[PDB]
Structures are given as C-alpha cells and as structure tokens.
Amino acid sequence: KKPLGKMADWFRQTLLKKPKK
C-alpha cells in the first residue's frame, strides 16, 4: 500500500469523518 493511499484514507477519516476499514 502506497503512503499516498495511506494518507488518502487518513484524510478520509480525519476530514471526511470516515473511519478506516
């Protein structure tokens, strides 16, 4: 998994309020 994809999910949880799963 690319760090970029990891950060993408990080933003999805952080900003879009979508818990990673």
UniProtKB/Swiss-Prot annotation:
Organs and tissues of expression: Highly expressed in liver, kidney, spleen, skeletal muscle and heart. Also detected in peripheral blood leukocytes, lung, placenta, small intestine, thymus, colon and brain.
Compartment(s): Cytoplasm; Cell membrane; Membrane
Posttranslational mods: Phosphorylated by IRAK1 and IRAK4. Also phosphorylated by BTK. Polyubiquitinated. Polyubiquitination follows phosphorylation by BTK and leads to TIRAP degradation.
Subunit structure: Homodimer. Also forms heterodimers with MYD88. May interact with PIK3AP1. Interacts with TLR4 and IRAK2 via their respective TIR domains. Interacts with BMX and TBK1. Interacts with EIF2AK2. Does not interact with IRAK1, nor TLR9. Interacts with TLR2. Interacts with RAGE/AGER.
Task performed by this protein: Adapter involved in TLR2, TLR4 and RAGE signaling pathways in the innate immune response. Acts via IRAK2 and TRAF-6, leading to the activation of NF-kappa-B, MAPK1, MAPK3 and JNK, and resulting in cytokine secretion and the inflammatory response. Positively regulates the production of TNF-alpha (TNF) and interleukin-6 (IL6).
Free-text domain note: (Microbial infection) The TIR domain is structurally mimicked by the TIR domain of B.melitensis protein TcpB.
Entry protein name: Toll/interleukin-1 receptor domain-containing adapter protein
Residues of the full protein shown: 15 to 35 of 221
